[PDB]
């Protein structure tokens, strides 16, 4: 069991039972912070590169280009370094100095775009670079690339199934790209055949999944739950496998992550607190009392030291 | 496989083969950054608390007190939170704001001591607090507590043995408390019976193991390789199982950690770069060409964002 490079070491993350949430131990969390670059995105950074290699879209001589400084940028960075690809990431010039150092340390060619143009200015610049030589540059597109939910169907989902001996009843996951809840739900419902409850979590400040499913005007808004609440329905969110949508506010997400640290000894990130807050509400309904609830914790506390978390 | 609290999830860390170090793949690293509080010390924080419980020295009503803000303080903090103990950690008032926030976030009662008195002022204050009510306070003493090397003999060592199918020939580990190399070496040499080469790594700036074994005056000195080079021979370093001592300088340790990030996609800490630098030198000697060399990487890059690493 020696991995040929760090990308093959993804996953096999632990399940830990919560003591101060839920009722009689019915809430258990999956620690995706224990991954090669310390988030859930390490899995999709690995598999989007692997699938592009298998497809012949990524070859020696091609460079990865993408517009993300978040967990997926870190994930693609370590995978590019591990497997020998140059990578260019675009981000607004306003990103934190700590994240510039981290990405630069991983060997990223960091292209800083105009601060006033935000995430759109970064996406545009990435698309411009790709336009300049499309036989040279590959953009992996985490919100629509099916290799994102596929790796969760092949690893994350089966890990939950095996570690719970098939007893999982509910999966609770915040939705960023949708890949996690989509792949996990397809694995458990379709490959293992168990009719669990799949719960998407989104910010109450930007409840676009709730609004969509209710037929209401979609009205996104700003929030502090980094990693979820993108303000649109991503292609990699399979709405057909979502059974329930829970909304969580930013303050309670933060307070819940702080409780995970101080009361459970779990170094969880902000969206981890959002997911547990939604799971805790379900776990304290009598209809969920005999149900085993598994919660994805996407990231780790030290990635948030300069945030409202601390 | 649902852990009753985060302390039981320690270990089972991956081995990754290096591509830009060594010769023909003979250097493989063990990623101790993938642990509950993201370092090798998570194992000893867990087991020193467990053994104190078994010994009856730690009970409900007793509080942990120790003098460390480093990886062991973080480890004891998450374990204390996970298992329901109050913990007080003393540290000089000069510690980084980021580490105060991290320890405070984990629920630590942080007692800041006089900056001019350094680590000794913190150890004194911890011993004073324990003196004030010894039936109430427990100090676990990582440099002398045998539960430190014991957990490496029971987990870290057998993991290396199993993941290499018994083919490991050399173990390379920086020495802080000595617990890692001591426990790993006892496991492989005594429990599995293989006569491997155990290599301690220390700073060239503070080469007290080398000086001791040579019968020379022990002369410690300052260095930047956080986590190793304590300036004395700890009780938990079993010199009898050390076959070789390699010295590494701070600059090369830093440069090697940066290479691990940018060339291997491995988010290693500073002492991880020191250990790989020493392993790389051995791996390029013809006498080590057919030998499988396993290197402990104690911690992860983001714990070092405010250091010379970045």
Numbering used by the authors:
A (entry chain X), B (entry chain X): 2 to 311
Per the authors:
O-acetyl serine sulfhydrylase (OASS), referred to as cysteine synthase (CS), synthesizes cysteine from O-acetyl serine (OAS) and sulfur in bacteria and plants. The inherent challenge for CS is to overcome 4 to 6 log-folds stronger affinity for its natural inhibitor, serine acetyltransferase (SAT), as compared with its affinity for substrate, OAS. Our recent study showed that CS employs a novel competitive-allosteric mechanism to selectively recruit its substrate in the presence of natural inhibitor. Results show that CS uses a noncatalytic residue, M120, located 20 Å away from the reaction center, to discriminate in favor of substrate.
Conformations of both α5-β4 loop of active site entrance and substrate/inhibitor binding “TSGNT” loop are altered in the M120A and M92 AM120A structures. On-rate binding constants of mutants of HiM120A, HiM92A, and HiM120 AM92A are ∼286-fold, 80-fold, and 200-fold lower than that of HiCS wild-type. Similarly, double and triple mutants of HiCS (M92 AM120A, M96 AM120A, and M92 AM96 AM120A) with M120A mutation also showed significantly reduced quenching. HiM92A exhibits approximately fivefold increase but in the M120A background, M92A mutation fails to reverse the effect of M120A. Only M96A mutation is able to reverse the negative effect of M120A mutation (please compare the affinities of HiM92 AM120A versus HiM96 AM120A). Results of double and triple mutants also show that M120A background mutants display significantly reduced catalytic turnover.
